[PDB]
């Protein structure tokens with residue numbers, strides 16, 4: 152484990168995702184509202200999945216070597232197995248908050264799968280220049296997601312209860328800022344141009360992951376928007 | 383790329399799926415009917431997924447070598463990753479058109495997963511004679527799907543609006559004819575008996591894919607069956 | 614095939630899953646109740662999936678070698694591909710029986726995916742002591758599932774029709790007893806401590822699989838709880 156300088160950030164990430172999972176699990180014990188139960192189930196699964204994948208990276212299972220640039224490059228593939236399941240769950244939290252229609256939910260989840268799937272292909276591609284073709288396709292899929300979150304959901308939240316509109320607006324802004332950083336870290340990190348070393352890259356993804364999952368969840372599960380209007 | 387004679391058909395397929403995706407995306411911009419939005423989302427995702435997998439084959443990522451018959455045989459595995467997601471989406475288009483019940487939808491999607499999954503196992507199997515055992519199981523799963531589309535959905539469409547009944551009947555006939563060709567191309571192509579060479583096999587799958595996805599989508603999204611009855 | 618002593622139990626399992634699939638398929642022909650159709654579709658898919666994965670193990674495709682303990686250990690990875698899809702389908706049978714809320718269904722299916730996913734990682738892990746870390750995480754996920762089936766569903770079934778309450782109680786008890794045996798067989802078998810040899814381990818999993826899928830299905834599909842109350 153300790154033979155890799157980035158191990159400290161993988162261990163911290165593992166701990167923070169595990170602690171986040173347990174807090175949400177305990178906090179959700181005393182909840183019977185069927186609407187609130189939906190948000191607790193979605194939001195608790197997110198850091199639980201991330202916990203297992205951070206642990207796999209810490210123990211060395213989620214790491215492979217990819218030859219490109221005449222070098223064997225360490226690629227943590229477990230990140231994409233994490234994101235494949237956690238990013239659509241996070242979008243479902245937002246879509247259920249605004250009572251989005253089914254067709255829009257399917258478009259979001261499908262574009263998200265394309266985003267993560269093409270990012271994985273780009274991470275494992277051995278022809279250096281082709282890695283950035285996949286990065287560009289994946290980034291186009293992300294821009295579609297961000298467009299929908301702004302010019303489809305925002306207008307839908309305003310016609311909703313005030314507390315669900317204000318909570319959505321906050322979580323929307325958090326998501327757009329944090330998610331946009333991921334393609335940048337990829338491009339300048341060891342998967343892309345190799346400007347930033349792997350140990351610093353790992354620290355950046357850990358800050359982003361914890362903020363986008365545990366920070367996101369703390370804002371959502373403390374809001375009254377997750378409960379139905381009741382007397 | 384150009385070192386493979388089949389590259390021209392992979393490049394054409396990539397272009398036609400990309401163009402198809404963009405047309406459906408633009409055409410769906412001016413749509414607010416929640417029913418129509420469902421069909422546009424399903425139908426636009428189909429060629430978008432196929433685009434990415436054709437590109438992976440063009441660039442050489444979606445290709446592996448499988449030893450059988452005393453030879454290293456080029457097997458494009460990316461086809462099955464495509465079909466795993468696009469064939470159930472196409473069946474969902476048909477099932478939603480006739481307002482099929484949930485139990486029937488699950489049976490269709492499950493049989494479809496078995497069809498594609500066993501076809502993938504057959505494509506990667508190293509014992510030559512066993513490849514055709516998997517082909518037979520996969521073909522049995524397809525025949526179940528075709529039976530349901532005829533002796534379960536057809537009777538359901540007649541009790542529906544006339545425009546949804548006539549549109550379903552057309553898309554049903556297109557699907558049964560085109561899908562039935564796939565097991566035949568597999569059997570006589572490089573995955574099976576090896577009668578037809580890979581470059582011709584690739585041309586045939588490209589014609590079938592574009593017809594079953596973009597041609598299918600053009601018929602559906604030009605129909606009024608996708609809109610609810612409104613004044 | 615016959616070069617492996619466990620082949621006899623893989624062949625028996627294949628036959629019993631295939632026969633089970635055909636019986637459920639025939640029995641479900643004469644069913645039009647939309648509620649009953651749901652249970653028949655879920656319950657017939659379970660042994661059909663298991664059939665294909667037992668066949669892959671029989672023919673040698675679903676087997677790999679994992680080095681640990683200074684030895685190349687035969688690991689049947691196809692079991693986890695089976696369980697990944699069949700265990701959530703079995704939980705869906707139970708959840709639909711008691712009309713569970715959506716949030717609870719998602720929590721069950723998500724915990725089940727974590728259970729199977731971490732068990733697969735543990736089966737393929739090359740550092741011997743780490744294999745049991747994954748076993749423990751997977752077992753914690755199972756205990757969560759069992760808790761929900763007892764202290765969330767049981768109370769919900771009592772407020773239901775008497776026949777659905779008594780049928781659920783029976784299937785609940787069958788599930789908790791049979792599922793609990795799996796982590797024990799893993800721990801003492803070739804994936805874990807290696808006390809029980811592989812051929813005996815394979816026999817035990819076959820008895821458990823057939824009971825948990827075909828036996829489970831025979832109890833459910835003979836009950837009147839799967840039909841709506843009708844005159």
Ligand SMILES: CC(C)CCC[C@@H](C)CCC[C@@H](C)CCC[C@@H](C)CCOC[C@@H](CO)OCC[C@H](C)CCC[C@H](C)CCC[C@H](C)CCCC(C)C
Pocket residue numbers: 235260261264265268269271272275427431434446459462463464466467502
């Ligand atoms: C509606 C939305 C959900 C739609 C989703 C969008 C999606 C279509 C976007 C594209 C996804 C696609 C790129 C997934 C590729 C997975 C692949 C990286 C797995 C590893 O295989 C890659 C190479 C080794 O580098 O295999 C070496 C050769 C091996 C012999 C490969 C044989 C196994 C194949 C991988 C079998 C295909 C399985 C499916 C891809 C499983 C789904 C994986 C997940 C990442 C989507």
Ligand SMILES: CC(C)CCC[C@@H](C)CCC[C@@H](C)CCC[C@@H](C)CCOC[C@@H](CO)OCC[C@H](C)CCC[C@H](C)CCC[C@H](C)CCCC(C)C
Pocket residue numbers: 466491492495496499500502503506658662665677690693694695697698733
């Ligand atoms: C309700 C419906 C959706 C049900 C679906 C029906 C489905 C059950 C039908 C059978 C599907 C099954 C054959 C999928 C097999 C995937 C497999 C080809 C992936 C590549 O692995 C094959 C060998 C190399 O040749 O791995 C070499 C050895 C490696 C060490 C393998 C270890 C990884 C395992 C593959 C882990 C299992 C992952 C799941 C199979 C992922 C789903 C893939 C998709 C193709 C279903």
Ligand SMILES: CC(C)CCC[C@@H](C)CCC[C@@H](C)CCC[C@@H](C)CCOC[C@@H](CO)OCC[C@H](C)CCC[C@H](C)CCC[C@H](C)CCCC(C)C
Pocket residue numbers: 196200203215228231232233235236271697722723726727730731733734737
């Ligand atoms: C809501 C719920 C459904 C959530 C589900 C819970 C889930 C997150 C729990 C953890 C699942 C995770 C451990 C799955 C790992 C699959 C992995 C074993 C496949 C084989 O790859 C392992 C190594 C060889 O030993 O690959 C060698 C290196 C290769 C180069 C690997 C590159 C391919 C990657 C495997 C791509 C990721 C694909 C996804 C993991 C596909 C889903 C598989 C299924 C088992 C979940």
Ligand SMILES: *C/C=C(C)/C=C/C=C(C)/C=C/C1=C(C)CCCC1(C)C
Pocket residue numbers: 234237238241266267270271286289290293330331333334337360363364
């Ligand atoms: C909890 C994890 C989250 C919210 C991860 C989000 C990840 C992304 C938005 C990743 C995007 C990428 C691109 C847009 C292209 C480059 C490759 C990716 C996958 C890093």
Ligand SMILES: *C/C=C(C)/C=C/C=C(C)/C=C/C1=C(C)CCCC1(C)C
Pocket residue numbers: 465468469472497498501502517520521524561562564565568591594595
């Ligand atoms: C857009 C792609 C489509 C509609 C693909 C359809 C593919 C099939 C219907 C494939 C069927 C197969 C068999 C029936 C057995 C032989 C292997 C397959 C997977 C080619």
Ligand SMILES: *C/C=C(C)/C=C/C=C(C)/C=C/C1=C(C)CCCC1(C)C
Pocket residue numbers: 696699700703728729732733748751752755792793795796799822825826
């Ligand atoms: C039809 C198959 C069924 C119902 C299989 C159930 C399997 C389990 C409940 C497996 C559980 C495991 C653990 C709890 C940890 C050890 C590894 C597993 C996956 C065997």
Ligand SMILES: CCCCCCCCCCCCCCC
Pocket residue numbers: 332335336346347348351
């Ligand atoms: C979206 C965030 C990207 C900003 C990356 C900042 C990295 C600064 C760290 C110093 C770079 C290390 C280079 C010298 C080793």
Ligand SMILES: CCCCCCCCCCCCCCC
Pocket residue numbers: 167170171174361362365366369
């Ligand atoms: C009462 C609110 C705080 C509860 C404690 C939460 C502990 C989980 C770890 C959170 C750290 C990361 C927060 C986002 C920066």
Ligand SMILES: CCCCCCCCCCCCCCC
Pocket residue numbers: 563566567577578579582
């Ligand atoms: C379902 C369509 C299958 C028909 C295949 C027709 C192939 C004819 C092309 C000529 C065969 C090439 C053999 C000589 C190289």
Ligand SMILES: CCCCCCCCCCCCCCC
Pocket residue numbers: 398401402405592593596597600
């Ligand atoms: C107005 C209808 C035609 C629009 C142009 C569609 C261009 C997408 C490519 C379609 C070619 C394949 C059609 C099926 C044979």
Ligand SMILES: CCCCCCCCCCCCCCC
Pocket residue numbers: 794797798808809810813
């Ligand atoms: C949950 C069931 C686990 C019980 C396992 C009993 C196995 C007894 C078979 C004899 C053990 C073989 C050891 C000598 C070869």
Ligand SMILES: CCCCCCCCCCCCCCC
Pocket residue numbers: 629632633636823824827828831
């Ligand atoms: C009339 C009920 C029996 C029908 C025959 C079922 C045959 C399928 C194989 C069942 C054997 C396994 C039963 C569970 C132990």
Ligand SMILES: CCCCCCCCCCCCCC
Pocket residue numbers: 466467470471474484487488491495
């Ligand atoms: C194995 C991959 C299957 C999933 C394909 C994605 C489409 C799923 C459609 C689900 C239809 C709704 C069923 C109720």
Ligand SMILES: CCCCCCCCCCCCCC
Pocket residue numbers: 697698701702705715718719722726
């Ligand atoms: C990782 C594979 C999980 C999918 C298994 C297929 C069954 C899914 C059941 C979904 C139940 C409906 C939830 C609302």
Ligand SMILES: CCCCCCCCCCCCC
Pocket residue numbers: 290294297298301331334335
């Ligand atoms: C185009 C939709 C408007 C909202 C999206 C904001 C774009 C942020 C740019 C992200 C940069 C990634 C490289």
Ligand SMILES: CCCCCCCCCCCCC
Pocket residue numbers: 521525528529532562565566
């Ligand atoms: C048996 C259901 C009737 C409709 C299915 C038509 C069968 C077409 C044969 C396809 C040939 C594939 C080898």
